[PDB]
């Protein structure tokens, strides 16, 4: 006898359902910040399902990262077989957006694109061609293909970090870096976490367990959010301010902390600019130039209280190192070149309070005060709990208690996100959050610091990526700043009258002084637009301006995609890209310190090709086109570069070395310190941890936490002052009233009564998975907009009624969800459903303009200069207001 039970044989039906003959490693190459390791299961050449591989190496004493994953991810293969797939190259035959196509061969498709690219260069300028492809960390090889293409032919690239509103503008202002953040495992080390405009139950799904686990291990957590969001059901305290008033909350906490002396004086003195001296007459930093013949305008003073004399602090912009290192993309300047110990306080005792007199070069005498003194005075006057209570609607008692708890628990940390980052004045608000961290001394400590989370912006091996995408150098590459590019070319109306904020003058002056780029040059129109790995039209702010003004300037729009998204639907040529499980690519994120990847489980389906292969194939047809059109080589005076189009393919592939996807992936690993040593084979078997990281040591068994090279190794902060700089004495900052952190009320230029909120949903990754049938079945079959019952009832609106939301920019009609946890006075629409989904007109971007805060255009003040994705205007959208009413063309009954 078998030793088998009565019904065992029949049960073979179900065991057969869980079987496979091949198992391969997969990843989901979308902007979600998961970078979740996965296995892909195929049987008889068909992908059957995926499942978390759960094989990230644990660290001692803290929860493992495993399993990660999420609801989109476990149905990711739906986009292999679903009704959305691009199978063949498509050329448009009706009007843009109609979905009227004809199938073309690759030859005809790529030749059309090649003909147009050569003509455009020949007849106009190379910079009238552009490629948009965001978030290289998501899929560095695929990102590098279009970028390398553009790099050799002279097309310009775009920015994404700031365009999306995710670049932490205030942190760059404060710390002189592009950005950095702890990996989420470090949350487990904190005793006190403030979730500040962040909804990780829905927007950090694979990492959220660390939060509830921290709480069970004894941590306290605070949620700060206008609506009672999904995250908030598990926190210990919920604070609910008026939208965009968080600045007042934070400054009042600063006030309490300072007035009650709950702060780390030693830290303030060593690591910030709060001791640096300000002239009472010009309200600028006292500088060495003011006092000494031939003195630096980039060196400063503090008052040393143990010697009763002024002293020049070490490490500011004017202090040069030793040996000078190479520029490091995510730093204002390479302050790593300085020696360890360099800005150690030693036995210095910088004053934080008092007035002092000093004698100028010209002999006359000026009163000076330290920044902290000015800050303290202004806070005592303007940012009491009682005043902030009136503004935010948070009680004065609550604000005080939050303040004391934040400053007493150690470590404490702030976790901020879209809710606080996507506002016009988010730069000043993050400066304020960084002021709170600085005051409590927790920057650079495990479980501490100001930690921002948004999208998949950070690729730790960034030099290996720059090697593959921009091999002749970043300084020999055209970049626009996409927020500016959209604003100008879509001829946006921001509704901000010049006499309030002269956006036009700032923008124009920033460009003609070369602080910010403007592409194309000489006022030419953009003519050719490559879009892939981002749904740029669907997600674009000022969308109605874009469709009406920018889109028709474009002679050719090319979308390369796995699926027909809205951008592709509105394009001229659509090319079929291989699914994530039919391609090879790396996949990384800032949330965890490990290198993920995907590999082919089956050959690319239909006539689809991998992104690397597509731009390689294009390169040949462009060679051919260039020969036909007798335009093979041309001068490019901007870079003193004679380009040879007849050798584009060899340029693309480094004379054939990088013609396979895997060589391109390995080329990346080989060319960064964070990854050199790692092979594709290793990664194929198991996720590997990065060898090193950015602004801290990466230590065995310990979660990364940023900025330790400054906080611990006492290297200077890459700022003008060499510290965490809270005083920015540039003209544009005085103009806006933001030389110091302080409260800036939101833009009310939309003269409509509801604030328009557009947060991210658990049910999609941006536009991707919006149209997934299963995801839609776990909702109400289409896009949604949320209203408080207190606003819906007087308007005659019922749950699931159609509703109409509009302002001067546009209009959207969407079914409503009435939710008690929503705050009255605002509506929330889960961002950017696809245009073709269940909407009677428009989309979430129809009611959003593009707006540019002047402080984000400053490009001539130390660490504030333009570098793509380092600094630039944020595409904010949370200041938007709209009106709402019941749509009456269709009022179905319920049952």
């Amino acid at each position: 006898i078998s030793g088998a039970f009565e019904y065992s044989g029949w049960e073979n039906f179900h065991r057969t359902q869980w079987s496979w003959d091949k198992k391969t490693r997969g990843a989901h190459l979308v902007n979600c910040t998961g970078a979740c390791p996965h296995f892909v299961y195929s049987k008889d050449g068909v992908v059957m399902r995926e499942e978390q591989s759960k094989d990230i190496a644990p660290m001692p004493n803290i929860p493992e990262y495993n399993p990660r994953g999420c609801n989109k991810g476990e149905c990711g293969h739906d986009y292999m077989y679903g009704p959305h797939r691009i199978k063949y190259p498509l050329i448009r035959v009706g009007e843009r957006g109609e979905g009227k196509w004809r199938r073309a061969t690759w030859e005809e498709a790529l030749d059309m694109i090649a003909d147009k690219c050569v003509d455009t260069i020949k007849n106009h300028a190379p910079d009238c061609i552009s490629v948009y492809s965001p978030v290289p960390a998501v899929s560095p090889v695929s990102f590098s293909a279009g970028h390398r293409f553009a790099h050799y032919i002279g097309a310009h690239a775009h920015t994404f970090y700031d365009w999306y509103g995710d670049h932490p503008t205030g942190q760059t202002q404060t710390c002189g870096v592009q950005g950095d953040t702890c990996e989420t495992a470090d949350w487990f080390n904190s005793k006190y976490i403030i979730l500040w405009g962040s909804n990780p139950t829905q927007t950090r799904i694979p990492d959220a367990h660390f939060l509830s686990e921290a709480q069970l291990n004894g941590a306290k957590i605070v949620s700060i959010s206008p609506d009672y969001n999904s995250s908030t059901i598990k926190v210990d305290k919920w604070i609910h301010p008026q939208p965009g008033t968080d600045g007042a909350l934070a400054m009042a906490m600063a006030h309490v902390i300072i007035k009650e002396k709950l702060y780390d004086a030693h830290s303030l003195k060593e690591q910030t600019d709060l001791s640096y001296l300000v002239r009472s007459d010009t309200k600028r930093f006292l500088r060495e130039a003011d006092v000494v013949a031939g003195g630096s305008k980039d060196k400063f003073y503090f008052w040393n209280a143990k010697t009763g004399k002024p002293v020049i602090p070490k490490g500011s912009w004017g202090d040069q190192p030793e040996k000078k290192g190479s520029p490091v993309g995510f730093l204002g300047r390479n302050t790593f070149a300085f020696p360890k110990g360099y800005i150690d306080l030693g036995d210095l005792d910088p004053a934080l309070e008092g007035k002092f007199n000093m004698q100028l070069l010209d002999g006359k005498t000026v009163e000076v005060r330290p920044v902290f003194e000015i800050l303290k005075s202004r806070l005592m006057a303007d940012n009491t709990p009682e005043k902030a209570a009136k503004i935010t609607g948070v009680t004065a008692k609550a604000i005080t208690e939050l303040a004391r708890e934040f400053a007493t628990a150690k470590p404490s940390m702030i976790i901020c996100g879209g809710g606080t980052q996507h506002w016009y004045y988010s730069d000043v608000l993050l400066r304020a959050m960084h002021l709170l961290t600085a005051l409590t001394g927790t920057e650079g400590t495990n479980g501490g610091g100001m930690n921002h989370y948004i999208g998949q912006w950070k690729p730790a091996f960034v030099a290996g990526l720059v090697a593959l995408a921009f091999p002749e150098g970043v300084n020999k590459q055209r970049f626009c700043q996409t927020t500016i590019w959209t604003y100008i070319h879509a001829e946006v109306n921001d509704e901000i009258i010049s006499s309030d904020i002269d956006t036009e003058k700032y923008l124009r002056d920033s460009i003609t002084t070369g602080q910010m780029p403007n592409m194309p040059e000489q006022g030419r129109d953009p003519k050719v637009f490559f879009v892939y790995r981002g749904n740029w039209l669907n997600q674009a702010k000022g969308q109605k301006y874009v469709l009406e003004n920018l889109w028709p300037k474009l002679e050719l729009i090319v979308d390369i995609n796995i699926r027909m998204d809205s951008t592709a639907l509105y394009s001229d040529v659509v090319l079929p890209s291989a699914h994530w499980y039919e391609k090879l690519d790396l996949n990384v994120t800032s949330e965890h310190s490990y290198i993920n990847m995907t590999e082919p489980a089956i050959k690319p389906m239909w006539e689809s090709k991998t992104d690397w292969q597509i731009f390689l194939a294009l390169a040949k047809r462009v060679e051919m086109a260039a020969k036909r059109k007798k335009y093979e080589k041309f001068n490019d005076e901007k870079f003193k570069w004679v380009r040879d189009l007849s050798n584009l393919w060899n340029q693309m592939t480094m004379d054939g070395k990088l013609a396979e996807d895997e060589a391109a992936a390995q080329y990346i690993l080989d060319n960064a310190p964070q990854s050199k040593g790692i092979t594709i084979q290793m990664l194929r078997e198991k996720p590997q941890r990065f060898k090193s990281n950015w602004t801290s040591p990466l230590k065995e068994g310990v979660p990364y936490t940023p900025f330790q090279y400054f906080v611990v190794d006492k290297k200077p902060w890459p700022t003008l002052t060499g510290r965490q700089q809270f005083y920015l004495d540039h003209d544009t900052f005085f103009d806006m009233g933001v030389e110091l952190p302080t409260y800036k009320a939101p833009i009310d230029a939309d003269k409509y009564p509801f604030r328009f909120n557009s947060p991210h949903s658990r049910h999609s990754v941006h536009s991707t998975f919006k149209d997934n049938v299963l995801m839609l079945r776990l909702q109400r079959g289409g896009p949604s907009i949320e209203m408080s019952p207190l606003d819906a009832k007087p308007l005659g609106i019922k749950d699931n009624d159609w509703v109409e939301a509009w302002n001067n920019h546009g209009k959207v009609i969407c079914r409503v969800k009435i939710r008690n946890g929503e705050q009255r006075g605002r509506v929330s629409m889960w961002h950017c459903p696809e245009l073709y989904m269940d909407l009677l007109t428009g989309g979430s971007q129809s009611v959003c303009p593009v707006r540019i805060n002047p402080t984000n255009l400053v490009g001539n003040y130390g660490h504030l200069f333009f570098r793509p994705n380092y600094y630039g205007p944020a595409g904010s959208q949370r200041d938007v207001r709209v009106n709402v009413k019941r749509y009456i063309g269709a009022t179905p009954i319920s049952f």
Binding site: G99, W238, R762, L840
Partner: protein, 329 residues
């Protein structure tokens, strides 16, 4: 009957479930992608309070009353939700105008009232309730089947509807008070959760446990005194079956939520009461809920004072294999 030699047992930590539906998706793409199964969610996750899936299932009837088998209702299809369907081809590829609307007109769906719950701002409250078949020690479904198509596995206590023995009598659908057997109108068979026995047989955790992203699921055999399920159920006694008064004696247990902010008073100040009403939890899990919460709050407070709490360590689950049969596959 014949009691099983071992009993597969689940513990769901309502302190940790983030309602991401990952488990709902994983189960569907593994076992219910077949004909007639589009409306079936063997594993689902509902907002509490709410209608649940199917709508008002908690008053459908079934289970036992003083030992007497009950015959409840058979939910109509609209209480499950007609699975929405879409014509993407026409709009994206065929030049048809008009939005890709859902058919039918949306009126109901398994997760229709997500995050709505109960109470007026600023005391709105809800949490997530994952559900599955409870592989009951007293399975109502199994007794009700006039064809003896439903059996309880001797080796692991998993309850299974034998698809060849099943003739579509639907007594089981009437009698399960959890509404977890689903009548397949195409095949004329009942379908339900198979406790992932093929994975269990290979020493792999069920998919809704192994793939749980919030790290809220525990599985094991309750006879293993070193399992997290024995620890939560028998030792610390902080995990309760859902609706015990149904009399089926579930083998899926819940750790009730103790995490959560306080009721906000009219002056804006915190009360001592939680936003989640005790009365709501007692409704779900009966009169033990108060004492379980006191234990959970007491142990969490030790961790807050930097003291040791082994119960908290169990819920934390720093290693997955401390929570579950190995999830690796």
């Amino acid at each position: 009957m014949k009691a099983p030699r071992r009993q597969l047992t689940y513990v769901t930590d309502l302190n940790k479930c983030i309602g991401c539906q990952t488990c709902t998706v994983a189960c569907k793409k593994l076992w219910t992608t077949g004909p007639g199964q589009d409306f079936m969610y063997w594993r689902n996750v509902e907002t509490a309070p709410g209608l649940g899936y199917p709508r008002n299932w908690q008053t459908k009837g079934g289970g036992y009353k003083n030992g007497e088998l009950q015959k409840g209702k058979i939910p109509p299809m609209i209480d499950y939700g007609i699975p929405f369907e879409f014509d993407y081809a026409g709009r994206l590829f065929e030049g048809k105008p008009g939005r890709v609307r859902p058919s039918p007109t949306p009126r109901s769906a398994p997760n229709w009232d997500e995050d709505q719950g109960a109470g007026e701002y600023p005391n709105n409250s809800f949490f997530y309730l994952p559900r599955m078949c409870n592989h009951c020690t007293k399975p109502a479904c199994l007794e009700a089947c006039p064809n003896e198509a439903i059996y309880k596995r001797e080796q692991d206590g998993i309850v299974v509807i034998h698809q060849d023995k099943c003739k579509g009598a639907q007594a089981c659908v009437q009698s399960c008070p959890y509404a977890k057997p689903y009548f397949n109108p195409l095949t004329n068979k009942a379908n339900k959760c198979i406790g992932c026995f093929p994975r269990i047989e290979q020493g792999v955790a069920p998919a809704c446990v192994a793939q749980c992203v919030g790290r809220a699921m525990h599985v094991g055999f309750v006879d293993d005194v070193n399992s997290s399920v024995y620890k939560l159920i028998k030792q610390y006694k902080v995990a309760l079956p859902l609706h015990p008064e149904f009399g089926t004696e579930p083998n899926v247990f819940y750790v009730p939520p103790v995490l959560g902010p306080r009721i906000e008073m009219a002056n804006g100040e915190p009360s001592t009461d939680p936003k989640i009403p005790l009365a709501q939890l007692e409704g779900l899990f009966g009169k033990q809920v108060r004492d379980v919460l006191a234990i959970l709050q007491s142990e969490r407070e030790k961790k807050m004072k930097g003291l040791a709490s082994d119960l908290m360590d169990v819920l934390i689950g720093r290693r997955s294999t401390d929570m579950m049969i190995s999830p690796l596959t």
